[PDB]
Design an enzyme around this catalytic site. Structure first.
Site, PDB file in Angstrom:
ATOM      1  N   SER A 200      38.690  39.388  47.304  1.00 27.70           N
ATOM      2  CA  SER A 200      38.498  38.841  48.778  1.00 27.70           C
ATOM      3  C   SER A 200      37.200  37.900  48.680  1.00 27.70           C
ATOM      4  O   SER A 200      37.746  36.401  47.705  1.00 27.70           O
ATOM      5  CB  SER A 200      38.102  39.888  49.180  1.00 27.70           C
ATOM      6  N   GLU A 333      48.815  42.384  51.129  1.00 24.78           N
ATOM      7  CA  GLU A 333      47.227  41.929  52.143  1.00 24.78           C
ATOM      8  C   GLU A 333      46.961  42.515  52.743  1.00 24.78           C
ATOM      9  O   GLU A 333      45.720  42.788  53.094  1.00 24.78           O
ATOM     10  CB  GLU A 333      46.922  41.112  51.243  1.00 24.78           C
ATOM     11  N   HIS A 446      45.278  45.161  50.636  1.00 20.92           N
ATOM     12  CA  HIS A 446      43.678  44.667  49.837  1.00 20.92           C
ATOM     13  C   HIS A 446      43.134  45.678  49.359  1.00 20.92           C
ATOM     14  O   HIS A 446      42.534  46.759  49.682  1.00 20.92           O
ATOM     15  CB  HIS A 446      43.588  44.122  51.247  1.00 20.92           C
TER      16      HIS A 446
END
Length: 531
Positions: A200, A333, A446
Protein backbone atom coordinates in the site's frame (compact mmCIF):
# COMPACT_ATOMS: atom_id res chain seq x y z
CA UNK A 1 19.24 -14.52 25.76
CA UNK A 2 22.28 -13.59 25.38
CA UNK A 3 22.92 -12.22 21.82
CA UNK A 4 24.83 -8.84 21.90
CA UNK A 5 25.80 -6.97 18.76
CA UNK A 6 27.85 -3.83 18.21
CA UNK A 7 26.51 -1.26 15.81
CA UNK A 8 28.27 1.90 14.62
CA UNK A 9 26.70 3.88 17.52
CA UNK A 10 26.91 1.16 20.20
CA UNK A 11 25.92 -2.23 21.54
CA UNK A 12 22.46 -3.73 21.51
CA UNK A 13 21.03 -6.73 23.28
CA UNK A 14 18.32 -8.78 21.61
CA UNK A 15 16.66 -12.10 22.38
CA UNK A 16 16.18 -15.58 20.92
CA UNK A 17 12.93 -16.99 19.68
CA UNK A 18 12.63 -20.46 18.17
CA UNK A 19 10.11 -21.32 15.50
CA UNK A 20 8.70 -24.86 15.18
CA UNK A 21 10.60 -26.88 12.61
CA UNK A 22 13.73 -24.78 13.03
CA UNK A 23 16.61 -25.71 15.31
CA UNK A 24 18.55 -22.42 15.18
CA UNK A 25 16.52 -19.82 17.07
CA UNK A 26 16.04 -16.44 15.41
CA UNK A 27 17.83 -13.48 17.08
CA UNK A 28 15.36 -10.57 17.43
CA UNK A 29 16.36 -6.96 18.17
CA UNK A 30 13.45 -4.62 18.82
CA UNK A 31 13.50 -0.82 18.82
CA UNK A 32 16.86 -0.04 17.35
CA UNK A 33 17.23 3.73 16.71
CA UNK A 34 18.36 4.72 13.21
CA UNK A 35 18.13 8.50 13.77
CA UNK A 36 18.09 11.18 16.45
CA UNK A 37 14.52 11.52 17.68
CA UNK A 38 12.84 14.22 15.56
CA UNK A 39 11.67 16.41 18.46
CA UNK A 40 11.23 20.15 18.99
CA UNK A 41 13.19 22.03 16.34
CA UNK A 42 13.87 18.77 14.44
CA UNK A 43 10.18 18.50 13.43
CA UNK A 44 9.64 19.11 9.70
CA UNK A 45 13.39 18.55 9.13
CA UNK A 46 15.42 15.63 7.69
CA UNK A 47 16.41 12.87 10.11
CA UNK A 48 19.81 13.20 11.78
CA UNK A 49 22.05 10.26 12.72
CA UNK A 50 21.38 8.86 16.23
CA UNK A 51 23.76 10.04 18.96
CA UNK A 52 26.14 7.34 20.21
CA UNK A 53 25.51 5.37 23.41
CA UNK A 54 27.70 3.82 26.06
CA UNK A 55 27.11 0.38 27.53
CA UNK A 56 24.52 -2.05 26.16
CA UNK A 57 21.15 -0.76 24.93
CA UNK A 58 18.21 -3.10 25.63
CA UNK A 59 16.57 -4.06 22.31
CA UNK A 60 13.84 -6.33 23.58
CA UNK A 61 10.82 -3.99 23.66
CA UNK A 62 8.70 -2.88 20.71
CA UNK A 63 9.19 0.82 20.20
CA UNK A 64 6.38 3.34 20.07
CA UNK A 65 4.66 3.87 16.75
CA UNK A 66 4.89 7.31 15.21
CA UNK A 67 2.13 9.68 16.24
CA UNK A 68 -1.16 8.94 14.48
CA UNK A 69 -4.88 8.36 15.14
CA UNK A 70 -4.70 5.60 17.81
CA UNK A 71 -8.13 4.26 16.89
CA UNK A 72 -7.43 3.87 13.12
CA UNK A 73 -3.86 2.73 13.80
CA UNK A 74 -4.83 -0.09 16.14
CA UNK A 75 -7.72 -1.14 13.93
CA UNK A 76 -5.29 -1.40 10.97
CA UNK A 77 -2.62 -3.25 12.97
CA UNK A 78 -5.29 -5.75 14.04
CA UNK A 79 -6.41 -6.43 10.47
CA UNK A 80 -2.86 -6.64 9.04
CA UNK A 81 -0.89 -8.36 11.82
CA UNK A 82 0.56 -11.83 11.20
CA UNK A 83 0.58 -12.48 15.02
CA UNK A 84 -1.95 -14.50 17.05
CA UNK A 85 -2.52 -11.37 19.05
CA UNK A 86 -2.08 -7.77 18.08
CA UNK A 87 0.46 -5.92 20.23
CA UNK A 88 -0.94 -2.64 21.54
CA UNK A 89 1.58 0.12 20.92
CA UNK A 90 2.37 3.55 22.45
CA UNK A 91 2.29 6.73 20.35
CA UNK A 92 5.25 9.07 20.21
CA UNK A 93 7.05 11.55 17.97
CA UNK A 94 10.04 9.58 19.22
CA UNK A 95 9.46 6.78 16.69
CA UNK A 96 12.44 6.38 14.30
CA UNK A 97 13.24 2.80 15.21
CA UNK A 98 13.61 -0.45 13.35
CA UNK A 99 13.15 -4.08 14.36
CA UNK A 100 15.40 -6.91 13.16
CA UNK A 101 14.83 -10.67 12.82
CA UNK A 102 18.01 -12.48 11.82
CA UNK A 103 17.98 -16.31 11.59
CA UNK A 104 21.81 -16.40 11.47
CA UNK A 105 24.16 -17.90 14.04
CA UNK A 106 25.85 -14.66 15.03
CA UNK A 107 28.79 -16.57 16.59
CA UNK A 108 29.38 -17.91 13.04
CA UNK A 109 30.05 -16.26 9.66
CA UNK A 110 26.96 -15.15 7.68
CA UNK A 111 26.17 -12.87 4.75
CA UNK A 112 22.42 -13.45 4.25
CA UNK A 113 20.00 -11.53 2.01
CA UNK A 114 18.25 -8.60 3.71
CA UNK A 115 14.60 -7.78 3.17
CA UNK A 116 13.55 -4.32 4.41
CA UNK A 117 9.83 -4.00 4.94
CA UNK A 118 8.04 -0.63 4.71
CA UNK A 119 4.55 -0.83 6.17
CA UNK A 120 1.40 0.76 4.70
CA UNK A 121 -1.40 2.86 6.16
CA UNK A 122 -1.76 5.67 3.63
CA UNK A 123 1.24 7.54 5.07
CA UNK A 124 -1.16 8.43 7.95
CA UNK A 125 -1.02 5.34 10.22
CA UNK A 126 0.86 2.06 10.57
CA UNK A 127 3.72 0.53 12.47
CA UNK A 128 6.73 -1.77 11.96
CA UNK A 129 5.84 -3.78 15.00
CA UNK A 130 2.59 -5.01 13.40
CA UNK A 131 4.76 -7.31 11.26
CA UNK A 132 6.53 -10.28 12.87
CA UNK A 133 9.57 -11.23 10.74
CA UNK A 134 10.10 -14.55 12.60
CA UNK A 135 8.53 -16.92 10.02
CA UNK A 136 10.01 -15.37 6.86
CA UNK A 137 13.45 -15.11 8.34
CA UNK A 138 13.44 -18.77 9.53
CA UNK A 139 11.68 -20.34 6.55
CA UNK A 140 13.80 -18.60 3.94
CA UNK A 141 17.10 -17.71 5.72
CA UNK A 142 16.95 -13.97 5.15
CA UNK A 143 17.52 -11.10 7.60
CA UNK A 144 14.13 -9.31 7.90
CA UNK A 145 14.12 -5.63 8.94
CA UNK A 146 10.90 -3.69 9.74
CA UNK A 147 11.26 0.14 9.69
CA UNK A 148 9.30 3.13 10.90
CA UNK A 149 9.05 6.55 9.37
CA UNK A 150 7.19 9.74 10.29
CA UNK A 151 3.45 9.81 9.44
CA UNK A 152 0.80 12.44 8.74
CA UNK A 153 1.68 16.02 9.57
CA UNK A 154 5.02 15.04 11.10
CA UNK A 155 5.86 12.92 8.02
CA UNK A 156 4.55 15.04 5.22
CA UNK A 157 3.73 18.61 6.15
CA UNK A 158 4.83 20.72 3.14
CA UNK A 159 4.63 24.46 2.38
CA UNK A 160 5.76 23.73 -1.15
CA UNK A 161 8.96 25.72 -0.65
CA UNK A 162 12.28 25.61 1.15
CA UNK A 163 10.91 26.31 4.67
CA UNK A 164 9.11 22.91 4.74
CA UNK A 165 9.75 20.91 1.53
CA UNK A 166 8.00 17.83 2.87
CA UNK A 167 8.67 14.11 2.38
CA UNK A 168 10.21 13.80 5.88
CA UNK A 169 8.80 10.32 6.10
CA UNK A 170 10.53 9.19 2.90
CA UNK A 171 13.79 10.80 4.18
CA UNK A 172 13.36 8.59 7.23
CA UNK A 173 12.90 5.58 4.98
CA UNK A 174 16.19 6.55 3.27
CA UNK A 175 17.89 7.08 6.61
CA UNK A 176 16.91 3.58 7.66
CA UNK A 177 18.47 2.18 4.43
CA UNK A 178 21.78 3.94 5.15
CA UNK A 179 21.69 2.50 8.61
CA UNK A 180 21.12 -0.93 7.12
CA UNK A 181 24.10 -0.51 4.75
CA UNK A 182 26.38 0.59 7.60
CA UNK A 183 25.19 -1.94 10.15
CA UNK A 184 23.45 -5.03 8.88
CA UNK A 185 26.65 -7.19 8.45
CA UNK A 186 26.76 -7.32 12.27
CA UNK A 187 23.33 -9.02 12.15
CA UNK A 188 24.47 -11.65 9.60
CA UNK A 189 23.11 -9.68 6.67
CA UNK A 190 24.69 -8.79 3.34
CA UNK A 191 24.77 -5.03 2.57
CA UNK A 192 25.32 -5.90 -1.10
CA UNK A 193 21.94 -7.72 -1.18
CA UNK A 194 19.16 -5.48 0.16
CA UNK A 195 15.59 -5.91 -0.99
CA UNK A 196 13.03 -3.25 -0.17
CA UNK A 197 9.42 -4.33 0.00
CA UNK A 198 6.16 -2.68 1.02
CA UNK A 199 2.40 -2.80 0.86
CA UNK A 200 0.00 0.00 0.00
CA UNK A 201 1.60 3.33 1.04
CA UNK A 202 4.69 1.10 1.67
CA UNK A 203 4.56 -0.02 -2.02
CA UNK A 204 4.19 3.56 -3.11
CA UNK A 205 7.24 4.37 -0.94
CA UNK A 206 9.28 1.57 -2.60
CA UNK A 207 8.22 2.93 -6.03
CA UNK A 208 9.22 6.49 -5.00
CA UNK A 209 12.59 5.21 -3.68
CA UNK A 210 13.23 3.53 -7.07
CA UNK A 211 12.80 6.98 -8.59
CA UNK A 212 14.89 8.96 -6.08
CA UNK A 213 18.62 9.73 -6.45
CA UNK A 214 18.88 9.90 -2.66
CA UNK A 215 18.29 6.15 -2.54
CA UNK A 216 21.15 5.25 -4.93
CA UNK A 217 23.13 2.12 -3.92
CA UNK A 218 20.86 1.62 -0.91
CA UNK A 219 19.04 -1.42 -2.36
CA UNK A 220 19.43 -4.06 -5.08
CA UNK A 221 15.86 -5.33 -5.53
CA UNK A 222 12.41 -3.87 -4.96
CA UNK A 223 8.88 -5.23 -4.41
CA UNK A 224 5.77 -3.01 -4.41
CA UNK A 225 2.61 -4.78 -3.16
CA UNK A 226 -0.72 -3.04 -4.00
CA UNK A 227 0.81 0.44 -4.40
CA UNK A 228 3.12 2.47 -6.65
CA UNK A 229 4.17 6.06 -7.42
CA UNK A 230 1.25 6.45 -9.85
CA UNK A 231 -1.28 5.52 -7.13
CA UNK A 232 -2.32 9.10 -7.34
CA UNK A 233 -4.08 9.45 -3.96
CA UNK A 234 -0.59 9.43 -2.28
CA UNK A 235 1.23 11.90 -4.58
CA UNK A 236 0.28 15.58 -4.49
CA UNK A 237 0.82 17.53 -7.70
CA UNK A 238 -0.01 21.22 -8.07
CA UNK A 239 -0.27 23.75 -5.27
CA UNK A 240 0.19 22.25 -1.79
CA UNK A 241 0.05 25.65 -0.09
CA UNK A 242 -3.78 25.57 0.57
CA UNK A 243 -3.44 22.33 2.41
CA UNK A 244 -0.51 23.66 4.46
CA UNK A 245 -2.57 26.75 5.31
CA UNK A 246 -5.64 24.77 6.32
CA UNK A 247 -3.48 22.68 8.67
CA UNK A 248 -1.79 25.74 10.21
CA UNK A 249 -5.19 27.44 10.72
CA UNK A 250 -6.60 24.27 12.27
CA UNK A 251 -3.57 24.23 14.54
CA UNK A 252 -4.26 27.89 15.50
CA UNK A 253 -1.30 29.29 13.58
CA UNK A 254 -1.21 32.27 11.28
CA UNK A 255 -0.45 32.00 7.59
CA UNK A 256 1.46 35.25 7.00
CA UNK A 257 4.39 33.44 5.43
CA UNK A 258 5.70 29.88 5.00
CA UNK A 259 8.53 30.27 7.43
CA UNK A 260 6.06 31.71 10.01
CA UNK A 261 3.64 28.80 9.59
CA UNK A 262 6.44 26.27 10.04
CA UNK A 263 7.84 28.02 13.13
CA UNK A 264 4.42 28.25 14.73
CA UNK A 265 3.74 24.53 14.07
CA UNK A 266 7.11 23.71 15.60
CA UNK A 267 5.90 25.25 18.94
CA UNK A 268 2.87 22.96 19.15
CA UNK A 269 2.80 19.95 21.45
CA UNK A 270 2.47 16.41 20.10
CA UNK A 271 -0.98 16.42 21.65
CA UNK A 272 -1.97 19.61 19.77
CA UNK A 273 -0.77 18.25 16.40
CA UNK A 274 -2.71 15.03 17.05
CA UNK A 275 -5.88 17.01 17.90
CA UNK A 276 -5.35 18.88 14.61
CA UNK A 277 -4.90 15.59 12.76
CA UNK A 278 -8.24 14.32 14.12
CA UNK A 279 -9.99 17.56 13.08
CA UNK A 280 -8.60 17.42 9.54
CA UNK A 281 -10.60 14.18 9.19
CA UNK A 282 -8.06 12.46 6.95
CA UNK A 283 -8.60 8.82 5.83
CA UNK A 284 -12.20 9.84 5.19
CA UNK A 285 -14.24 11.24 2.36
CA UNK A 286 -15.48 14.80 2.78
CA UNK A 287 -19.06 15.08 1.42
CA UNK A 288 -19.09 18.92 1.30
CA UNK A 289 -18.66 21.56 -1.40
CA UNK A 290 -15.89 20.53 -3.76
CA UNK A 291 -14.29 17.04 -4.13
CA UNK A 292 -11.28 18.81 -5.68
CA UNK A 293 -10.53 20.48 -2.26
CA UNK A 294 -11.27 17.46 0.03
CA UNK A 295 -8.04 16.01 1.43
CA UNK A 296 -8.17 12.38 2.75
CA UNK A 297 -4.46 12.64 3.25
CA UNK A 298 -1.39 14.61 2.53
CA UNK A 299 1.52 12.66 1.24
CA UNK A 300 4.34 12.51 -1.18
CA UNK A 301 5.17 15.87 -2.86
CA UNK A 302 7.61 16.90 -5.59
CA UNK A 303 10.09 18.52 -3.20
CA UNK A 304 13.27 18.89 -5.31
CA UNK A 305 15.42 16.73 -2.95
CA UNK A 306 13.81 13.28 -2.87
CA UNK A 307 11.82 13.75 -6.13
CA UNK A 308 13.10 16.28 -8.67
CA UNK A 309 10.08 15.90 -11.00
CA UNK A 310 6.79 13.97 -11.05
CA UNK A 311 7.02 10.15 -11.31
CA UNK A 312 5.43 10.44 -14.78
CA UNK A 313 8.29 12.68 -15.96
CA UNK A 314 11.03 10.62 -14.23
CA UNK A 315 9.86 7.46 -15.93
CA UNK A 316 10.08 9.06 -19.37
CA UNK A 317 13.60 10.29 -18.48
CA UNK A 318 14.71 6.81 -17.36
CA UNK A 319 17.17 8.09 -14.73
CA UNK A 320 15.75 5.80 -12.01
CA UNK A 321 17.30 2.72 -10.39
CA UNK A 322 17.05 -0.17 -12.84
CA UNK A 323 17.08 -2.87 -10.17
CA UNK A 324 14.95 -5.96 -10.38
CA UNK A 325 11.37 -4.97 -9.50
CA UNK A 326 8.34 -7.05 -8.68
CA UNK A 327 5.07 -5.15 -8.89
CA UNK A 328 1.85 -6.83 -7.91
CA UNK A 329 -1.78 -6.37 -7.05
CA UNK A 330 -4.68 -8.22 -5.54
CA UNK A 331 -7.82 -9.28 -7.35
CA UNK A 332 -10.17 -6.92 -5.51
CA UNK A 333 -8.14 -4.09 -4.13
CA UNK A 334 -11.24 -2.09 -3.16
CA UNK A 335 -13.42 -5.05 -2.21
CA UNK A 336 -13.82 -4.44 1.59
CA UNK A 337 -10.88 -3.23 3.64
CA UNK A 338 -10.27 0.27 2.21
CA UNK A 339 -13.89 1.44 1.94
CA UNK A 340 -14.65 0.12 5.46
CA UNK A 341 -11.70 2.17 6.79
CA UNK A 342 -12.82 5.46 5.20
CA UNK A 343 -16.46 4.85 6.07
CA UNK A 344 -17.07 4.93 2.33
CA UNK A 345 -20.68 5.83 1.16
CA UNK A 346 -21.02 2.17 0.12
CA UNK A 347 -23.90 0.82 2.23
CA UNK A 348 -26.71 -0.64 0.11
CA UNK A 349 -26.51 -4.06 -1.55
CA UNK A 350 -26.92 -2.28 -4.90
CA UNK A 351 -26.09 0.99 -6.68
CA UNK A 352 -27.69 2.85 -9.65
CA UNK A 353 -26.00 4.88 -12.40
CA UNK A 354 -26.66 8.40 -11.12
CA UNK A 355 -25.42 7.76 -7.61
CA UNK A 356 -22.39 6.06 -9.17
CA UNK A 357 -21.47 9.29 -10.96
CA UNK A 358 -21.83 11.56 -7.92
CA UNK A 359 -20.01 9.02 -5.76
CA UNK A 360 -17.18 8.85 -8.28
CA UNK A 361 -16.96 12.67 -8.18
CA UNK A 362 -16.91 12.75 -4.40
CA UNK A 363 -14.26 10.03 -4.80
CA UNK A 364 -11.91 12.49 -6.60
CA UNK A 365 -9.30 12.38 -3.78
CA UNK A 366 -8.93 8.61 -4.35
CA UNK A 367 -9.21 8.34 -8.13
CA UNK A 368 -8.37 11.83 -9.26
CA UNK A 369 -10.93 11.79 -12.18
CA UNK A 370 -12.17 15.09 -13.69
CA UNK A 371 -15.93 15.73 -13.84
CA UNK A 372 -16.19 15.65 -17.66
CA UNK A 373 -14.75 12.09 -17.74
CA UNK A 374 -17.08 10.70 -15.07
CA UNK A 375 -20.11 9.82 -17.27
CA UNK A 376 -17.91 7.90 -19.72
CA UNK A 377 -15.97 6.09 -17.00
CA UNK A 378 -19.12 4.99 -15.18
CA UNK A 379 -20.89 4.03 -18.39
CA UNK A 380 -17.86 2.02 -19.44
CA UNK A 381 -17.85 -0.05 -16.24
CA UNK A 382 -21.55 0.06 -15.26
CA UNK A 383 -23.43 0.48 -18.57
CA UNK A 384 -23.52 -3.14 -19.84
CA UNK A 385 -26.08 -4.20 -17.24
CA UNK A 386 -29.27 -2.88 -15.61
CA UNK A 387 -28.59 -5.12 -12.58
CA UNK A 388 -27.86 -2.70 -9.68
CA UNK A 389 -26.13 -5.33 -7.50
CA UNK A 390 -23.61 -6.03 -10.27
CA UNK A 391 -23.26 -2.27 -10.80
CA UNK A 392 -21.93 -2.11 -7.25
CA UNK A 393 -19.31 -4.75 -8.02
CA UNK A 394 -18.20 -3.26 -11.25
CA UNK A 395 -17.90 0.06 -9.47
CA UNK A 396 -15.46 -1.35 -6.89
CA UNK A 397 -13.54 -2.86 -9.85
CA UNK A 398 -13.44 0.64 -11.28
CA UNK A 399 -11.95 2.28 -8.21
CA UNK A 400 -9.55 -0.65 -7.76
CA UNK A 401 -8.34 -0.35 -11.39
CA UNK A 402 -7.66 3.38 -11.20
CA UNK A 403 -5.97 3.30 -7.78
CA UNK A 404 -3.80 0.18 -8.23
CA UNK A 405 -4.20 -2.00 -11.31
CA UNK A 406 -3.57 0.51 -14.03
CA UNK A 407 -0.84 2.46 -12.20
CA UNK A 408 0.98 -0.76 -11.39
CA UNK A 409 1.10 -2.05 -14.95
CA UNK A 410 2.14 1.35 -16.17
CA UNK A 411 4.99 1.44 -13.66
CA UNK A 412 5.99 -2.11 -14.47
CA UNK A 413 5.97 -1.37 -18.27
CA UNK A 414 8.06 1.75 -17.85
CA UNK A 415 10.53 -0.10 -15.67
CA UNK A 416 10.74 -2.97 -18.15
CA UNK A 417 11.23 -0.49 -21.01
CA UNK A 418 14.10 1.21 -19.13
CA UNK A 419 15.87 -2.19 -19.32
CA UNK A 420 15.29 -3.68 -15.87
CA UNK A 421 14.24 -7.18 -14.98
CA UNK A 422 10.58 -6.77 -14.01
CA UNK A 423 8.04 -9.24 -12.57
CA UNK A 424 4.29 -8.93 -11.96
CA UNK A 425 1.67 -10.85 -10.03
CA UNK A 426 -2.02 -10.77 -9.34
CA UNK A 427 -2.96 -12.36 -5.98
CA UNK A 428 -6.35 -14.05 -5.69
CA UNK A 429 -7.04 -15.83 -2.43
CA UNK A 430 -9.17 -15.23 0.68
CA UNK A 431 -7.20 -15.81 3.88
CA UNK A 432 -8.92 -17.60 6.79
CA UNK A 433 -7.45 -14.79 8.95
CA UNK A 434 -9.69 -12.26 7.16
CA UNK A 435 -11.92 -10.24 9.45
CA UNK A 436 -15.29 -11.88 10.11
CA UNK A 437 -17.11 -8.74 8.86
CA UNK A 438 -15.67 -9.08 5.35
CA UNK A 439 -18.00 -11.03 3.02
CA UNK A 440 -16.82 -14.54 2.06
CA UNK A 441 -17.22 -13.56 -1.58
CA UNK A 442 -14.48 -10.92 -1.35
CA UNK A 443 -11.36 -12.57 -2.62
CA UNK A 444 -7.91 -10.96 -2.84
CA UNK A 445 -8.86 -7.83 -0.92
CA UNK A 446 -6.25 -5.10 -0.18
CA UNK A 447 -3.73 -6.66 2.18
CA UNK A 448 -4.78 -10.29 1.70
CA UNK A 449 -1.28 -11.27 0.44
CA UNK A 450 0.38 -10.10 3.69
CA UNK A 451 -0.68 -13.25 5.48
CA UNK A 452 1.21 -15.31 2.95
CA UNK A 453 4.29 -13.08 2.64
CA UNK A 454 4.77 -12.96 6.46
CA UNK A 455 3.68 -16.47 7.26
CA UNK A 456 0.59 -15.94 9.26
CA UNK A 457 -0.12 -19.71 8.98
CA UNK A 458 3.00 -20.42 10.96
CA UNK A 459 2.03 -17.97 13.72
CA UNK A 460 -1.76 -17.84 13.92
CA UNK A 461 -4.10 -20.82 14.19
CA UNK A 462 -6.74 -22.24 11.83
CA UNK A 463 -4.79 -22.46 8.56
CA UNK A 464 -5.69 -25.24 6.06
CA UNK A 465 -3.04 -27.33 4.33
CA UNK A 466 -3.67 -25.26 1.21
CA UNK A 467 -3.11 -21.94 3.07
CA UNK A 468 0.12 -23.32 4.61
CA UNK A 469 1.53 -24.37 1.23
CA UNK A 470 0.46 -21.03 -0.26
CA UNK A 471 2.56 -19.12 2.31
CA UNK A 472 5.57 -21.37 1.86
CA UNK A 473 5.48 -20.74 -1.89
CA UNK A 474 5.00 -16.95 -1.57
CA UNK A 475 7.85 -16.67 0.91
CA UNK A 476 10.15 -18.79 -1.22
CA UNK A 477 9.30 -16.71 -4.31
CA UNK A 478 9.90 -13.49 -2.34
CA UNK A 479 13.21 -14.67 -0.88
CA UNK A 480 14.38 -16.24 -4.16
CA UNK A 481 13.84 -12.79 -5.62
CA UNK A 482 15.82 -11.28 -2.75
CA UNK A 483 18.62 -13.74 -3.50
CA UNK A 484 18.59 -13.53 -7.30
CA UNK A 485 16.46 -10.78 -8.75
CA UNK A 486 14.32 -13.65 -10.07
CA UNK A 487 11.72 -15.44 -8.00
CA UNK A 488 12.07 -18.80 -9.76
CA UNK A 489 13.22 -21.99 -8.12
CA UNK A 490 12.95 -25.72 -8.50
CA UNK A 491 9.73 -26.91 -6.87
CA UNK A 492 7.83 -23.71 -7.62
CA UNK A 493 5.52 -22.82 -10.52
CA UNK A 494 7.29 -21.00 -13.35
CA UNK A 495 6.93 -17.25 -13.08
CA UNK A 496 7.65 -15.61 -16.42
CA UNK A 497 9.58 -12.36 -16.65
CA UNK A 498 7.36 -9.35 -17.33
CA UNK A 499 8.78 -8.81 -20.80
CA UNK A 500 7.35 -7.68 -24.15
CA UNK A 501 4.81 -10.56 -23.77
CA UNK A 502 3.75 -9.34 -20.33
CA UNK A 503 3.79 -12.64 -18.54
CA UNK A 504 2.81 -12.51 -14.85
CA UNK A 505 1.82 -14.89 -12.12
CA UNK A 506 -1.70 -15.53 -10.90
CA UNK A 507 -1.01 -16.42 -7.30
CA UNK A 508 -3.63 -18.29 -5.30
CA UNK A 509 -4.95 -21.80 -4.72
CA UNK A 510 -4.11 -22.61 -8.34
CA UNK A 511 -0.99 -20.65 -9.06
CA UNK A 512 -0.23 -20.30 -12.76
CA UNK A 513 1.26 -18.02 -15.38
CA UNK A 514 -0.80 -15.73 -17.61
CA UNK A 515 -0.29 -12.64 -19.82
CA UNK A 516 -1.29 -8.99 -20.33
CA UNK A 517 -2.45 -8.16 -16.82
CA UNK A 518 -4.98 -5.30 -17.07
CA UNK A 519 -4.16 -4.71 -20.76
CA UNK A 520 -7.58 -3.51 -21.76
CA UNK A 521 -8.12 -1.42 -18.54
CA UNK A 522 -4.78 0.28 -19.14
CA UNK A 523 -5.69 1.22 -22.74
CA UNK A 524 -9.12 2.41 -21.64
CA UNK A 525 -7.98 4.73 -18.85
CA UNK A 526 -4.90 6.05 -20.65
CA UNK A 527 -6.96 6.97 -23.73
CA UNK A 528 -9.62 8.53 -21.50
CA UNK A 529 -7.13 10.57 -19.40
CA UNK A 530 -5.54 11.95 -22.63
CA UNK A 531 -8.92 13.37 -23.88
Amino acid sequence: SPPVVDTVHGKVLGKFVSLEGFAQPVAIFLGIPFAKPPLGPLRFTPPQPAEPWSFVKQATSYPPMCTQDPKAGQLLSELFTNRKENIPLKLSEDCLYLNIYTPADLTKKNRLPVMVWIHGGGLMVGAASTYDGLALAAHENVVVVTIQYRLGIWGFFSTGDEHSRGNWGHLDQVAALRWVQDNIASFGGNPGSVTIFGESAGGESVSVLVLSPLAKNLFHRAISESGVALTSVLVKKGDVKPLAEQIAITAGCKTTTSAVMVHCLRQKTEEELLETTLKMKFLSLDLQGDPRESQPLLGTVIDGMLLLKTPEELQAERNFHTVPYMVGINKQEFGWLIPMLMSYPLSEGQLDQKTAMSLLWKSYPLVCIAKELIPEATEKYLGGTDDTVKKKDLFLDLIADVMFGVPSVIVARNHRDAGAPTYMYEFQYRPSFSSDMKPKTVIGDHGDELFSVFGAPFLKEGASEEEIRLSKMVMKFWANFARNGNPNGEGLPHWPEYNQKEGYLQIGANTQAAQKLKDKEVAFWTNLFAK
